[PDB]
Amino acid sequence: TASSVLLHTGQKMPLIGLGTWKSEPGQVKAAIKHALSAGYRHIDCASVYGNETEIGEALKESVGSGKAVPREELFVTSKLWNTKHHPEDVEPALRKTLADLQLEYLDLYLMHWPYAFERGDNPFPKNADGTVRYDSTHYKETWKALEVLVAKGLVKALGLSNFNSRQIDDVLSVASVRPAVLQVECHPYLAQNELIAHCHARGLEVTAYSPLGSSDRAWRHPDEPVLLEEPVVLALAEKHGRSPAQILLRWQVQRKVICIPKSINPSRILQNIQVFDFTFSPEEMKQLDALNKNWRYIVPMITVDGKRVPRDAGHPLYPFNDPY
């Protein structure tokens, strides 16, 4: 039944939050309204999603002084984008996020990726051919600049997104403020058991994006199976009288993995938080474990002579070259 986990700061972070990744500015306000009505108290944002101003307007309607949801009862996460890794750019980036969201502080602020892109006002400084120009700033230097934000009261907790185990330990080796959360892709095809175990041994909680297996990206590999249609998922759905999405989310809830499924659909937004009133047996958890196959959907790609290949795997700080 328990619906949050404790961060090392003492903060309660709800096990289900609303993902705003891919939510267009024109649609995100309705999504936020529906989520708040459905009982969501955790919203996951990022500057690069290009919709924080609209999210700020939506939250201002029902969150804060004298409003239905007091500010302290909402958990808001945002993320520092790849072009803002230079120490001088870190606080201005956070301040811009706070201005757009119309907030005094964030509950959690993440480094969106461990690797940096060329500094400037273009989030994707691309060459004519589509590649992105890189920057050499190390994530340890960016981390030190992030730590200052906690002392100023602007952010309650800091964390990491798309870091691997080696990179997490590297941050830990120099940290004066400890990361509280790792956010990565996670679902039964990419169960992240090794990386989750690693985080638990380091005191970090884990947040899963793409917990429903990115069926919106299925067309990229049309002969691959769809996670939501896996026979074991369908069988669990029938046994428990729950939707396949609820099966995939409950699996993570029971693993104590926070989930941030992205949606603007009112029926799916509602469904996605109704995961605290049924339970899987040890046998069922092991059946879901059988799906693990190291299939990663979320990798930046680029088309080269009619084929999609990884775009960023040559960056010195790329996270996906190690086993975990």
Q: Kindly list the structural domains of the chain, giving each domain's residue range(s) and its CATH number in brackets, ordered by start.
A: 1-324 (3.20.20.100)
Instruction: Report the alpha-carbon distance of residue 56 to residue 61 in Å, rounded.
Output: 9
Starting at the edge strand that comes first in sequence, how are the strands of the sheet with 75-80 ordered?
Answer: 18-19, 42-44, 75-80, 108-111, 158-161, 181-185, 205-209, 258-259
297 counts as catalytic: no
Instruction: Report the alpha-carbon distance of residue 287 to residue 190 in Å, rounded.
Output: 14
Number of H helices, E strands in the chain: 10, 14
Tokens of 274: 């109704």
263 is in an annotated binding site: yes
271 is in an annotated binding site: yes
Tokens of 246: 């609820």
Question: With left for phi above 0 and alpha for psi between -120 and 50, is residue 113 left, alpha or beta?
Answer: beta
Identify the active-site residue in 49, 115, 209, 297: 49
215 is in an annotated binding site: yes
Which residues, 6+ apart, have CB-to-CB distance to 66 below 8 Å? none
Tokens of 213: 């297996």
212 is in an annotated binding site: yes
18 is in an annotated binding site: yes
Inter-residue contact 293 to 122 (CB < 8 Å):
no
Q: How was this structure determined?
A: X-ray
Instruction: Report the alpha-carbon distance of residue 116 to residue 142 in Å, rounded.
Output: 10
Question: Residue 26 class from Cβ within 10 Å (0-12 exposed, 13-18 middle, 19+ buried)?
Answer: exposed
Q: Is the dihedral of CA 181, 110, 186, 244 positive or negative?
A: positive
Give the type of residue at 123: P
Closest by CA position to 115, among listed 76, 80, 85? 85
Inter-residue contact 156 to 150 (CB < 8 Å):
yes
State the alpha helices, DSSP H only, in the chain: 25-38, 52-62, 87-101, 139-151, 165-174, 193-202, 231-240, 244-254, 266-272, 282-289
Q: 190-195 — which CB contacts under 8 Å span 24+ positions?
A: 190/292, 190/293, 190/294, 190/295, 190/296, 190/297, 191/289, 191/291, 191/292, 192/324, 193/292, 194/165, 194/323, 194/324, 195/164, 195/165, 195/324
**How many other C-beta atoms are found inside a 10 Å radius of the C-beta of residue 119?**
17
